[PDB]
Amino acid sequence: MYRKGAQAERELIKLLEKHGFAVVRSAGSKKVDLVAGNGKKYLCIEVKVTKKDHLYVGKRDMGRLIEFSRRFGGIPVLAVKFLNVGWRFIEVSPKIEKFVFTPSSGVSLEVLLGIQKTLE
Amino acid sequence: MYRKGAQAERELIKLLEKHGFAVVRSAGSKKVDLVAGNGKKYLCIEVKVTKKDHLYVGKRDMGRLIEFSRRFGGIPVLAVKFLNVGWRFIEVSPKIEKFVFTPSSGVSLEVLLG
């Protein structure tokens, strides 16, 4: 099994739960890796981890995530752990095509959730 | 031990998809078996299977489903597949249960989905 991937996933789940989200892992990553809901927001997440300072995401993978997210009713999210740098989240746009993401390309979990613009 | 259950889960996933829901099967089924969404209705499902014409459903078991569905933001659903007869569904309530489920209990999938 992809051990490094499983380790990153475990870390991410706890982060999500810390923010009040109930998380479910999709068996075999069928359509997506994880689905998380906190009562008002639903996230459909694809998890990636790399030691490189950039990451390429195929058009197919992007399409699978956007498609499932739209049907399910959740925000399509690409969660990447840039080793030696940290987690970066990108709420992917409807555009289904290739794309290269860098740490400067994503936001923190707090911003992804919009904590920075919520009084409480 | 888990064969009839694994099979039931796969079949229910198809039924839901046929109705427009995107479904994910929980790995290990720690809290629930399936989570489905179609954009308006969200479901957190505990799937049970039995060869008998009745099934005992405990309060604790349902308490876990309800708590997870409450946190997640989905409808806590109990799906029971009575072998050789059919599926019956019921939205579980926080109020304890510890009741017996039969092929005449709850509602049909179509009515559950309104």
From Swiss-Prot, chain A:
Activity regulation description: Cleavage inhibited by RadB in the absence (but not presence) of ATP.
Stated consequence of mutating residue 89 to A: Wild-type HJ cleavage
GO biological process, one term: DNA recombination
Outcome, altering residue 46 to A: No HJ cleavage
Binding locations of Mg(2+): 9, 33, 46
Impact reported for residue 10 to A: No HJ cleavage
Temperature-related activity annotation: Optimum temperature is 70-75 degrees Celsius, enzyme is fully active after 16 hours at 90 degrees Celsius.
GO molecular function per UniProt: crossover junction DNA endonuclease activity; DNA binding; magnesium ion binding
Keywords of the record: DNA damage, DNA recombination, DNA repair, DNA-binding, Endonuclease, Hydrolase, Magnesium, Metal-binding, Nuclease
Family: Belongs to the Holliday junction resolvase Hjc family.
Functional summary from the UniProt entry: A structure-specific endonuclease that resolves Holliday junction (HJ) intermediates during genetic recombination. Cleaves 4-way DNA junctions introducing paired nicks in opposing strands, leaving a 5'-terminal phosphate and a 3'-terminal hydroxyl group that are subsequently ligated to produce recombinant products. Cleaves both mobile and immobile junctions. Binds 4-way junction DNA, a synthetic Hj, binding is not competed by dsDNA.
Subunit-structure text: Homodimer. Probably interacts with PCNA and RadB.
Protein name: Crossover junction endodeoxyribonuclease Hjc
Organism, as annotated: Pyrococcus furiosus (strain ATCC 43587 / DSM 3638 / JCM 8422 / Vc1)
Lineage: Archaea, Methanobacteriati, Methanobacteriota, Thermococci, Thermococcales
Gene: hjc
